[model samples]
Target: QDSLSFGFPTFPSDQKNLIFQGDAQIKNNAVQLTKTDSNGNPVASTVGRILFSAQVHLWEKSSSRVANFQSQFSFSLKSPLSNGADGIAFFIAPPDTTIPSGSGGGLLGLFAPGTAQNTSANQVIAVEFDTFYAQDSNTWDPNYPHIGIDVNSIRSVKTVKWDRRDGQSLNVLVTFNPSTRNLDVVATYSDGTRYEVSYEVDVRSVLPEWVRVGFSAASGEQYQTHTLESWSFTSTLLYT
Candidate 1:
């Protein structure tokens, strides 16, 4: 098996660019690009790859706009139909051309509404530890947020309850094995307790090969703030 890992300065310097900007009170410690939109929303950065991992924390100093508050870390893919493997996460939102919105059911403040839905046409998979419930189809878990798996787009396939009892740091890992043509995800807390969260799916059954991987987060319009503390990724070709 062969492996590749990304820690800091994940992409080649030239390709890195900013995608969104959060509140002034919040600070990011990783390598990132910064830019502002016409509406004055801060944008982060983006990359193109297959699988990765990340650690993140939500700060209490966030804004109050429910619709405009969100933070994310993610990446881009060429054409969904051609990429046999494709997925991203908000362990942190990757770079997006869309504007930030509220923390609703599907309003993760990352990709576009349609893009986040996990539809067959979108060809993206998302594992969101969501804090807000913006969509009507969403249900309340612990009055905070929950963990869920979103495939193709932002539609939920599986969800679990979560609580912000402590200022705990969370670790999320995602991998796509080309040989087995399957994607596997795992999440663990800093206390060494692993969440009952794990997922596996065959990429070929849904998407093509050659997809990109990265991170994303957002403050909703109603004012919700989240942060990504650390992130990384590793992968190897599958062999029989």
Candidate 2:
């Protein structure tokens, strides 16, 4: 194979290729990306953030300062249909491999709320599934559930809402072409429609050369189940 790939309910390192951080774990053969205590309550306001950020073959470096990468995953966020609170995100961040404390609500487990937008502590480049736009509380934008791209800051630069159902196992593809600095994301609906968005990012400005890539999710007042049904990513910059 010319590319590196992996799927959940699986660990390429015999369960070592992926690291489970926060509330994330393999339960019933799926990556249960969130957790709860008895009585259906989240352990903490921040406990719902589950970070899966360990990869053996990472695009941590490249000679041309770019790497061709494709990461695809299937997932669902199940909660009260009335409104989904916080949401999930795919990201690249610093070597530190834990969910930030109090990284729920709109923070999306990417960073803390009070720090500078470009802080070095787990500085991130992410594509987010923003479920709610709490403009009144967190003070953000575009009051709707949409997808957005972020650089260091969780506030997105570009955003588009789902043109399809957000549940029932959404297949999402995020591809990076460093030559053009193009980052493209396509999510497939159960009916086969694809919602696409693109952005130009010089990630070298946000993330360190040595970083980790994976998924993170959160639910503040709205208790939601963030599950990774399956996932695969290969970095040709570093081969198998």
Candidate 3:
């Protein structure tokens, strides 16, 4: 999608067939992914999976030799006194526009009840910012308060701590280089410090030719103000 675009909930712009799923709300000035309901009640216990997808598929693999893309945005996640549950993630899933079931807390709002973190059948690749408990510390590295590159499995082949401060808006950039089959990401803190990591993702193996790119967030009994300030994306296809 060379023309990908999104931004602040305030001073809205042309949505052009955007879709919001689950407990997501487009308030007057911001897009609130989760944290509270219309009655202002928290989305306690249950998962608040919000999928934000544009009206069209960003790219189709079958149409070209490779697809290169990058997405950048500002976001914040936290509650007062650091009482935040679960976390949020960005992903490229099958073109299905519906929300998946059994999404909550540690699940990161992806996969079914029985899927493992390292393996999945859903044909989805997600980069998750996890704030919940250390999921299987004995198995996965770093556990909680980390960035996980989840390919099918929630188990992060690569993980890193979030250097950014909580509750403060932070900048994140994600890019996929099909030529090298690499996925790179960098999160910039308010102080300009950067926490970055890269993973080799065989896009053709984990996703279909046509895919849906979007963001999803969840809150358990412990909740957070999952907020997205703005987003921009573009995909360049290279073919002879």
Candidate 4:
């Protein structure tokens, strides 16, 4: 199948095309994208990533065509208390993306200190499920659990409150339409509450023709367990 699907009751024997970085691991039949101690407790000040091993075909140069894609995932976030530290994201980044040092806090493991804003080389985009709010000029996050569309910076171009239930699995769908240049996200909680948000941008202007797709997460002084239960992605590419 051309599409990527993972419902990890158990991972494939060879792990197939999965790339786990930093503290990311296959645990409890899910992609755990943050640190857990030996006793299976969430560790503070941790960051991790899990990427599809191959580069996705994003855009074609000669035809000036870009792929239309949809990604759906189920995840569960368990905070030690009412408030959680940082959050998780579905990211599209340059193929050679790296988790920068000291990016374990509000950066969501997507950017480093100096590259958080106005850096052309840091061409990364994400749909962030943020659980905490920090008021700084660069990270002007909204209060409460919110979903934000990020491009090249942690500061989102758009955001909406997400009614996230701690320790309960929630579903999210993200769609990108190159024709409209719109990236849209819909997050649904178990209680039937839903939050939707969208942003318009041609990723070709922000990313390379070939890019990496993955999940990234981080925990700061306050921590939580970031678990990806399942994920499926498909793209309509003319070249395919």
Candidate 5:
């Protein structure tokens, strides 16, 4: 069997390698990441996360070999309001990473305000599906409804416009190439629109040898329901 491989057509039925935090819950067999209450009602200004329970081996310290991995997931966002605020992200973080305070809005539950952005202590890599644009100095979001690659900070290193439709299922595939140190993303929408983006970064330097991979979402003043429909992941280890 493959060392790290699992697929969730739906959630909560088999939470074998799953961790839910904050407002995250199972509703209608889907993992609702944010803006949903216990009764399946919408709540504004909220943050939630769903992480893999086990720490994934990213690199071998002895041989300095990094693992190549890929993850695919489907998700949707629904809102009563006219527009969605904030957004969701697929992230890899240090072991035992917790939801930071004041990360409910554009922070996407990954980073707290007044914290280090690109430091070892704040090590994180994420692919963000951003919906809102905040021109403030801290956030510095480029535009609305875009995909960004973030390294240890909310400010993205690269971004591309993404036209997201509310309540429409969107599928994403993220691949990490250890040899080239490149992260590639492909997003396909229900209406047949697709986007491809890539970024290069040294994961061994930005993160620890072992890391937790998961998803995080948040809603700001304008709110929306973030739901994850399906997910799968696999890692190809060098020595395996």
Candidate 6:
């Protein structure tokens, strides 16, 4: 099995196989790339679970128009297995839509409705390692950075608190087993502790055999800067 890496150029003159690219001009503290079905649904593939890893470097750039921005990495896969796992963590952005407003506290930099401060009719799931607090005290508490598993792209199904003094370098792995039609998400940190999450949904129900995978990131009124280091994926043709 071989692995493929993709994403934006990091150092001077560095580049990889890019799936999509957005405006270089920072807007409202965010950068994003999206893919959609001709019918307008999210475009996803059933090749296999994709593995993505990124080294996000957070810095403050005066020229950057967005307020608080944190270099972040995101990827989404459309499932194809019947009764298959919805596909687990590593993570997923809400379906293709506009960038959410910048409100609440840090929220690991996500601002979509239901997921963050505001609530929208159409909800999107965001499995986030939230770092900031929100105006809705019932939804989130300040002073605590936590890892959360969100549902309906709206609120959280589960959340656990963790320390925030550490730097940001995320390693995420997602595996889709065609036989079982299960998707699993595994995330690791610099300190060596790892977390695993998963979902069951049929990829075939949502997408065709081949679908596109993509990445996105954003900054909000907080005015921070974040960059993605790298991303990669692998596929296997199984005969059982």
Clashing pairs in 2: none
TM-score to true structure, per model:
0.55, 0.83, 0.84, 0.91, 0.93, 0.47
List the global CA lDDT of all models. 0.39, 0.67, 0.68, 0.82, 0.84, 0.36
* lDDT of residue 88 for candidate 3: 78
Q: Give residue 80's lDDT in candidate 4 (0 to 100).
A: 66
Candidate 1 lDDT score at position 193? 62
TM-score of 6: 0.47
| 1-240: candidate 2 lDDT, tens digit per residue | 224555563423245556677676665456666785554333335433333444333344444444578888888776644666677788877666577666776787767767625444446778887777767865665777788888767767788876324457788999988677789999887778778899988766665666667888876776576767777776655321
Question: What is candidate 5's lDDT per residue for 1-240, written digit by digit as tens?
Answer: 125877887886556667888888778899888857666666788899989887788888787678899999999988777767778999999889999878778889998877646454488999999888857633578857799999987878889999869889999999988878889999999768999999999887889888889999998787788889999999866642
Residue 65 C-alpha lDDT in model 5: 76
Q: Find the candidate with the highest lDDT and give its number.
A: 5
Q: Please give the distance, in angstroms, between residue 30's alpha carbon in candidate 6 and its true position after superposition.
A: 15
- Range of the 10 consecutive residues with the lowest summed lDDT in candidate 2: 41-50
- Sort every candidate by lDDT, greatest first: 5, 4, 3, 2, 1, 6
Clashing pairs in 3: 9-29, 9-30, 10-29, 117-153, 117-154, 117-155
Q: What count of clashes does model 3 give?
A: 6
Residue by residue across 1-240, what tens digits does model 1's lDDT show?
Answer: 133444542343332323333321213343222222355333333221222322111111132111111122322211112111112244322222233343222344344554454464454556766554534433322234566766654546776675432335566665544444344455666667665554566544443333334444433232222334545544333332
Which candidate, 3 or 4, would have the higher lDDT against the true structure? 4
Which prediction has more favorable lDDT, 4 or 5? Answer: 5
Sliding window of 10 residues with minimal summed lDDT for model 3: 2-11
Scored by Cα lDDT, where does model 5 land? Answer: 0.84
Off by over 4 Å in 5: 37-41, 116-121, 136-139
Q: Who wins the TM-score comparison?
A: 5
Query: Which has the higher TM-score value, candidate number 1 or candidate number 6?
Result: 1
Could you give me the TM-score of model 5 versus the true structure? 0.93
